Amino acid sequence: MSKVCIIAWVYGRVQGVGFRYTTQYEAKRLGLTGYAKNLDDGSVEVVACGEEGQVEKLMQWLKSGGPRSARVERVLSEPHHPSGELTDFRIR
């Protein structure tokens, strides 16, 4: 037991601006997995495995709101324990 995946739901105007741009590059530095999907209510769901600390390095940008065009209204986080080990990071 080491791997600690987490699910982060981002509210406000996050979908459409292509928020999931640098997510790939950054993810490559950490070597984590997961995916960045979008809800049907205007929100964006981001998931990531590995050590919380390592994951948090790229999440700095999520909680920074890189694209000023976005309107990060709110964001909620929960524990994620998916079955098996994920291959690679991807998108919707």
38 in active site = yes
The total domain count for the chain is 1
State the DSSP code for 87: -
- Please name the method used to determine this structure: NMR
Catalytic residue among 38, 74, 90, 92: 38
**CATH number, domain containing residue 81:** 3.30.70.100
13 in active site = no
Chain centroid to Cα 5, Å, comes to 11
Structural element, H or E, at residue 53:
helix 52-62
Catalytic residue among 20, 29, 68, 92: 20
Residue 12 belongs to domain spanning: 1-92
b/e burial code for range 48-71 (CB count within 10 A of at least 16 → b) = bbbeeebbeebbeebeebeeeebe
Structure tokens at 2: 């080491």
